[PDB]
Amino acid sequence: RPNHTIYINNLNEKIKKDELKKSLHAIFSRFGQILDILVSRSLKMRGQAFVIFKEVSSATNALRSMQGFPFYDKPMRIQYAKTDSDIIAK
RNA sequence: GGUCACGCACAGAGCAAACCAUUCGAAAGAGUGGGACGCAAAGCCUCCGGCCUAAACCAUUGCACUCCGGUAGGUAGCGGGGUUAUCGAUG
Ligand SMILES: Nc1ncnc2c1ncn2[C@@H]1O[C@@H]2COP(=O)(O)O[C@H]3[C@@H](O)[C@H](n4cnc5c(N)ncnc54)O[C@@H]3COP(=O)(O)O[C@H]2[C@H]1O
Numbered sequence: 001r002p003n004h005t006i007y008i009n010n011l012n013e014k015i016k017k018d019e020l021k022k023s024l025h026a027i028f029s030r031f032g033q034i035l036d037i038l039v040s041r042s043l044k045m046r047g048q049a050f051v052i053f054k055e056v057s058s059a060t061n062a063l064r065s066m067q068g069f070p071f072y073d074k075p076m077r078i079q080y081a082k083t084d085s086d087i088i089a090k
Numbered sequence: 091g092g093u094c095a096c097g098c099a100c101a102g103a104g105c106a107a108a109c110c111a112u113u114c115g116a117a118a119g120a121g122u123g124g125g126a127c128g129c130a131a132a133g134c135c136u137c138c139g140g141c142c143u144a145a146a147c148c149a150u151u152g153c154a155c156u157c158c159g160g161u162a163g164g165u166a167g168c169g170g171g172g173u174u175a176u177c178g179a180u181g
């Protein structure tokens with residue numbers, strides 16, 4: 001089940017691309033190094049993000065401590081990405 | 091002269107990117123001034139593609155990695171197309 005990348009939905013959709021990333025970056029650094037934060041505001045990708053960590057444990061630490069963490073008036077829903085991000089698959 | 095098409099010229103004339111001041115806008119970006127990178131339509135119009143922005147309304151609780159909802163805007167100096175225009179070495 002666990003993977004380097006964590007899936008995050010129930011995010012506020014009204015947030016910009018620049019802001020959203022900067023805000024997630026500031027939050028999840030507590031758990032390890034983030035290689036890149038994948039945020040797009042396309043129809044299917046609104047209110048969700050992907051955070052890719054250095055080690056898998058970093059994602060686990062993040063996932064277990066931030067579940068339902070009220071971020072921008074909304075408690076986050078965090079789960080592991082079911083498929084490895086294209087950066088890791090390389 | 092009128093006209094179909096075209097740009098290797100020749101005669102004029104014109105337009106003005108960047109950057110800056112300044113206003114309008116949530117933004118993309120536009121107006122007005124100063125500026126000239128360049129433009130044969132860099133006059134004009136969003137009808138066809140694309141790109142950009144997304145404040146509001148609407149839809150959306152969605153596993154993406156090329157981007158990509160409806161609608162709203164922008165860009166004609168991204169292309170197509172429509173339209174009007176200076177010169178004729180040109181077909
Ligand atoms: N439709 C036309 N009517 C009359 N003459 C034409 C023409 N198309 C081309 N030419 C002639 O050929 C020259 C080169 O044209 P080009 O388009 O390659 O290169 C041109 C063009 O790209 C640009 N340019 C100049 N004036 C322009 C304008 N009024 N509108 C658009 N672009 C212009 O600067 C270049 C040099 O200008 P320049 O007049 O000295 O030189 C031009 C012009 O004399």
Ligand SMILES: [Mg+2]
Pocket residue numbers: none
């Ligand atoms: Mg001349």
